[PDB]
Amino acid sequence: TDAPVSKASTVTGFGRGTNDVHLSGMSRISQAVLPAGTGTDGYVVVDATIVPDLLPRLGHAARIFQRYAVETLEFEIQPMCPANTGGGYVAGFLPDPTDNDHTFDALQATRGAVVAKWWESRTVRPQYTRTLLWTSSGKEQRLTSPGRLILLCVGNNTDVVNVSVLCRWSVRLSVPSLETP
Amino acid sequence: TNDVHLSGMSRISQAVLPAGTGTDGYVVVDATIVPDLLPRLGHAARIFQRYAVETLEFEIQPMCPANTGGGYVAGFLPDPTDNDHTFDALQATRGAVVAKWWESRTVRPQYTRTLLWTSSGKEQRLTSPGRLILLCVGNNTDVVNVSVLCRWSVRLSVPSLETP
Amino acid sequence: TNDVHLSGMSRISQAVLPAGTGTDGYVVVDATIVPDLLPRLGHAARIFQRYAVETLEFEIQPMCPANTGGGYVAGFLPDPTDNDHTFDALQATRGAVVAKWWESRTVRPQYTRTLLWTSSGKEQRLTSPGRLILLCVGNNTDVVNVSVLCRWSVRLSVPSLETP
Amino acid sequence: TNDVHLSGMSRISQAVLPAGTGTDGYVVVDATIVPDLLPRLGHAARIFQRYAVETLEFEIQPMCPANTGGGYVAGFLPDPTDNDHTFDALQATRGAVVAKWWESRTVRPQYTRTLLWTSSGKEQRLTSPGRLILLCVGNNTDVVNVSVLCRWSVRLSVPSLETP
Amino acid sequence: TNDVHLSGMSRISQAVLPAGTGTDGYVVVDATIVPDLLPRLGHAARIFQRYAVETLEFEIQPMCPANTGGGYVAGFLPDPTDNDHTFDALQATRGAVVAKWWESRTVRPQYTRTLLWTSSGKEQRLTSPGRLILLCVGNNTDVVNVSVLCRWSVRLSVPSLETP
Amino acid sequence: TDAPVSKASTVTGFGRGTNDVHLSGMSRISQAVLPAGTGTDGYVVVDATIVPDLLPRLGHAARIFQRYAVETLEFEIQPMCPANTGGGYVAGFLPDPTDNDHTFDALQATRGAVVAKWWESRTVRPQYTRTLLWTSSGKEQRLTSPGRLILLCVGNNTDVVNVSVLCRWSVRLSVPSLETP
Ligand SMILES: [Ca+2]
Ligand SMILES: [Ca+2]
Ligand SMILES: [Ca+2]
Ligand SMILES: [Ca+2]
Ligand SMILES: [Ca+2]
Ligand SMILES: [Ca+2]
DSSP states (O other): OOOOSSOOOOOOSOSOOOOOBOOEEEEEEEEEEEOTTOOOTTOEEEEEEOOTTTSHHHHHHHHTEEEEEEEEEEEEEOOOOOTTOOOEEEEEEESOTTOOOOOHHHHHHSTTOEEEETTSOEEEOOOOOOSOEESSOOSOGGGTOSOEEEEEESSOOSSOEEEEEEEEEEEEEEEEOOOOO | OOOEEEEEEEEEEEEEEOTTOOOTTOEEEEEEOOTTTSHHHHHHHTTEEEEEEEEEEEEEEEEOOTTOOOEEEEEEESOTTOOOOSHHHHHHSTTOEEEETTOOOEEOOOOOOSOEESSOOSOGGGTOSOEEEEEEESOOSSOEEEEEEEEEEEEEEEEOOOOO | OOOEEEEEEEEEEEEEEOTTOOOTTEEEEEEEOOTTTSHHHHHHHTTOSEEEEEEEEEEEOOBOOTTOOOEEEEEEESOTTOOOOOHHHHHHSTTOEEEETTSOEEEOOOOOOSOOOSSOOSOGGGTOSOEEEEEEOSOOSSOEEEEEEEEEEEEEESOOOOOO | OOOEEEEEEEEEEEEEEOTTOOOTTEEEEEEEOOTTTSHHHHHHHTTOSEEEEEEEEEEEOOBOOTTOOOEEEEEEESOTTOOOOOHHHHHHSTTOEEEETTSOEEEOOOOOOSOOOSSOOSOGGGTOSOEEEEEEOSOOSSOEEEEEEEEEEEEEESOOOOOO | OOOEEEEEEEEEEEEEEOTTOOOTTOEEEEEEOOTTTSHHHHHHHTTEEEEEEEEEEEEEEEEOOTTOOOEEEEEEESOTTOOOOSHHHHHHSTTOEEEETTOOOEEOOOOOOSOEESSOOSOGGGTOSOEEEEEEESOOSSOEEEEEEEEEEEEEEEEOOOOO | OOOOSSOOOOOOSOSOOOOOBOOEEEEEEEEEEEOTTOOOTTOEEEEEEOOTTTSHHHHHHHHTEEEEEEEEEEEEEOOOOOTTOOOEEEEEEESOTTOOOOOHHHHHHSTTOEEEETTSOEEEOOOOOOSOEESSOOSOGGGTOSOEEEEEESSOOSSOEEEEEEEEEEEEEEEEOOOOO
16 A cells, blocks of 8 residues: 555544443332321422432433433332321322422322322322433423422321332433533 | 313312211211312313213222221212211112221212203202212221222313303 | 313403504514413313314404504414514414404414423423414504404313412 | 425515595506515525416405595506506406405416526516506595505425525 | 425534644534524525424535644534533544544434424524534644535424524 | 231332343543653553543443443554654553553563554454453452553654544443442
8 A cells, every 4th residue: 555645544433332221220219207297288298300310320321321211110109107107198290390289189180199098008100201301401391300209198197107209210211422410 | 072081089078087076977078079079170160061970989098097996987879969967878878888997998889970060050960960978987086087089080061161 | 092172262362452553563462372361271271281282273353443444464473482573474474364453354373283281381382382463554543452362172181180 | 306385475565555646547566576575485585596486366455444435456467577557457467356445355366387586687577477566446535554465385496595 | 284395515614723723622613503504494494483304414524734633523412402512422422423634524413303493492402403513632733624514404394484 | 808017018129120231332541642752662651440430431330230241342542643753652451450560562462462653543452351340449459450551652753642542342230239439
């Protein structure tokens, strides 16, 4: 071969990363300790917006991706109080992150909402958006979070209640990037 | 057409029965089942004139300690004009249940499937499928927090705005 | 499924433009078409979450003395964020109409057939199919009472109760 | 291919004819239909080179007091170079209309279905399908505001950017 | 319908990097790809409300002597709100390229095919498919005249005139 | 059913996360700018220990895993200097992280080492350990890093050289956890 003025660049494998990871797992999105007698009807025990940052192991994975799509979402309310406590709880998943209404009727309207006594556990199988949602935050949060889990006291509680909200997320990240805080 | 079909669960009544005030025959919840009581169906019927119940299944959640003493009986009179609030009416009707204060039961009632009206009238016989009664069988020991959740599925028609 | 197909007519706005102030380019009815404006859809949106406008048609119904010698132009900008109130912007939009103050007209615009959100929010392009603008083209000799009726056919979905 | 089929409505002209000067044979709206006049087609012609008018229909929309006792005649001469402004020339052309000042009318002319040029040039017979002429047939007692709306369906081709 | 399909090449940005001012990490072109930047598509989107990118292929032509020392790296973030302007973001994304200052490369990016809006909004996430970044890897020796030409092919809809 | 003193816990899906992700990609491990005349024989241009922290997108993924195994490792030296510069470079991968020797012979001994002129690019296909390595640091680094890449100036450089070391890693993380800094 001859000697050129400047040789051509030989970078072949650039910008060819993997664009599909089906990360999944289970994590605790909220832990609450209700003092006795403060579980008044309508009190908001848990108000958690489902974002990749909220889920611990999903936050780092979404930091290196642009868009994620929730493939399977399920919640499991697991109170740890004894069986001699009186009162009820309601758990639901509002599919609109901007909604700020916190009433029993609002949760009861949504599909998959559960009402139970504090000495009994329930699973909230919700209705979420299957579309692609951006990992990073923005002006409108409806493109970033599938919804918000809300857990209220239906009735006045007698003893101290230690509730724990668990989430079984299953996402499919795509559009590789190196998103930064 | 205008056959809007709606369904969902809604708490018709939340009641707090105090401890030691559970004399037998005391009525905890005496509710005429009109669409106004149901929150979502209340908003739905405020913009409609006629509805027709297609599936009605009440379910009772009392939040009480498992060691409480007492019981509840529930029934659904298919006649809204009935004013009898005794155990006899409940035990006569179909789908009535009786249970302890910590148990959850479903009152699967016998309701009418005709087209009723979403607004008040001279007679309730064309405005509501019936009346739910919950009575306190036996004397309660602790405080009772009962909530009656109604699984309803109606079909609305004749669009028209209404004011309560 | 959970979809309900509702339809009806509503008066989004009614304005009394005084005589002599009907200068060209003066906004008369500048309304944003959200479910709140339509009363029946206002009640029906409170019990749902996401709607899609399947059919939208406006009617200008001025009520003026025949001596009035002015005109109006009506249009439906499919961009809620648009703040342009000029004649050309209206006329370019599909279905825009120009008429005299003594002739009712119909506007058949090009609504976006996407699933919007019933509730309000930070971005209006996801909550409103558009906004109607009516301009008084010519000076009117008499006071003109203009009413902008609307005919809508939405498809609600994702049942959920909400608050104003 | 490179062809795009656009359509819309536009106000080619709007004229305030004062009371008393509505003599017969007085030109009111004498406009040449080039893409410049139509705003949306004005923007769309700057990104193309050759267009063909597939459908062209005008609407006269006068806004006058009912006391006005004059009339108008509207026509579309398919020759841009024509400088004749007489009643017979208008009436002979296909689609010409005669009406009173309180009746909107539609003109459906015979446009030439050939591929013209979006840009201007030395000969106007290759750049404009024609020209609209409106004459005030009778004397008007009141001031008349006349608006000439246009409905066009062009087929642009030969993509290229241009300058005004 | 109104599915106007357009395509063609257009220079998004012409930049003149001075000699000896090529510190590593210096951003030469940081352009949010809205239709306004593209000349022909700018005119096209001034008469439309929604567009949907169907084929996007940037190509870089630097006019430099073959003996110049330095290099350029180019990438396309599919998120317009991203403000990171470092080599890490480019090397992370798909289709990014790095080359010498005399070479021409095509940045075949990963873009969204949804229907965006042709006008500004609160969020850029519905107005532009992404953001192109060109960084100066290494220190330039001579003066650099870089031009980024965008092969675009979009589909517009919802006719409406707009003013920038 | 009867009413027990205390009901049994119903947490079923606990500690059942995914233990296999084949994360892969390419990243720049070092960027150097050598001033003219300072490329003396033996000068250490690049001395990079291959750890999950060094690789940007791999750091977050290894933060949520215990052990990783390098399935495919390849380096690509890509100088950006013109074709009129004189001098050479040597690139190699020492498979022993504790080794601190920095000489031309040490690199030349290892398999896959490359010697070239500065106006020409080379790929370093090294010999690495296929065994499982812990993600987190410890007392002995030989259980955490496959090796160390070293890039030296073979001869004196004439002009300014801007070298860039790229790595094509391909790991297989396992043993899920939530390792913390
Ligand atoms: Ca982002
Ligand atoms: Ca009524
Ligand atoms: Ca909402
Ligand atoms: Ca031309
Ligand atoms: Ca707009
Ligand atoms: Ca560890």
